[PDB]
Amino acid sequence: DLPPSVDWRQKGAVTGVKDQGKCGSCWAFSTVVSVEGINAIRTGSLVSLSEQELIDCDTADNDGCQGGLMDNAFEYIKNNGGLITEAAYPYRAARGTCNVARAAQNSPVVVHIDGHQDVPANSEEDLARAVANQPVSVAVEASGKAFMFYSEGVFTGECGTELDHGVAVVGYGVAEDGKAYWTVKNSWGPSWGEQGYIRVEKDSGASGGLCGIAMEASYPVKTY
Structure with a gap:
């Protein structure tokens, strides 16, 4: 059965919040959160990984600062x-x-993954159990005014599903007022939202999740 709450930050599987800056490299940051997460969970060692490698080297389908996809990045890391x-x-x-x-040559440390798995499209339920096991990469619509200027609390909207930003869910819980939420690690620096995080309402009425958070979620697989 699913735990009522999950916070990979408390379990030492989440690094600090970063700022992607002007580069449209959200896809690379989202990918790294998930890989840093599963590596910490499988080895017990939390290591900060290189989003820059993805930007410079994962060029087959992803397009550096102009955009990309986390699932394409997982494939790159695997191969x-x-x-x-x-x-x-x-x-x-x-x-x-x-x-x-x-x-x-002078810095050989790397993290391997066996591949990745997609969370069934639009299933917040499947997303919840994936999150219960590890941080998960997701796509959301972050261009809306409400999301852009979010500062605190459980974000209830307003936002559509014009997916344009990749982030990662590192947990979930229930606010004191009884509202369920997803703990999302953003890459707009620690001064944005709640220390760089935004709690997006979970199990809302929106079929594919608020802001389309459950529409294109995926996570890496690692075992040894």
């Missing part, structure tokens, strides 16, 4: 020997030549 650490390949907020090879 290209994992993801290197942040320290080895720091974020530049701009796309540059893929240089992880020489970067790994």
Whole structure:
């Protein structure tokens, strides 16, 4: 049965909040949250990974600062020997030549994944049980005024489903007023929302989840 509450931050499986800056690299940050998460859960070691590697090297279908998809990124990580650490390949907020090879010369630490799994489309229920096991990458509509200027509390709307931003759900719970919510780690810096996080109403009336949060969710698989 599903736990009534989940917070991977408290379990040491979530790194600090970052700021993607002007670069449209939300997809890379979302991907990293999920990979950092499953690696911590499987090894007990929380390591900060390189969103920059995805931006520079995962170029087959993803398009650097112009956008991308988390599932395409998971595939890249699976087929290209994992993801290197942040320290080895720091974020530049701009796309540059893929240089992880020489970067790994002096900094070899990487995290591997076996692949990824998609949460059945529009299922907040399936999303809940995926979250109960690990952080999950999701897409939402974040261009709306309400979302953009959110500061605190359980975000109830207003927002549609014009998916344009990739983030990650690191947990879920119920507010004191009885409202269920998803704990979403954003990449707009720690001064936005609740220390960089936004609690999006969970199990709302919206078929695919508020802001379309359950429309295109996926997570990485890792075992050993």
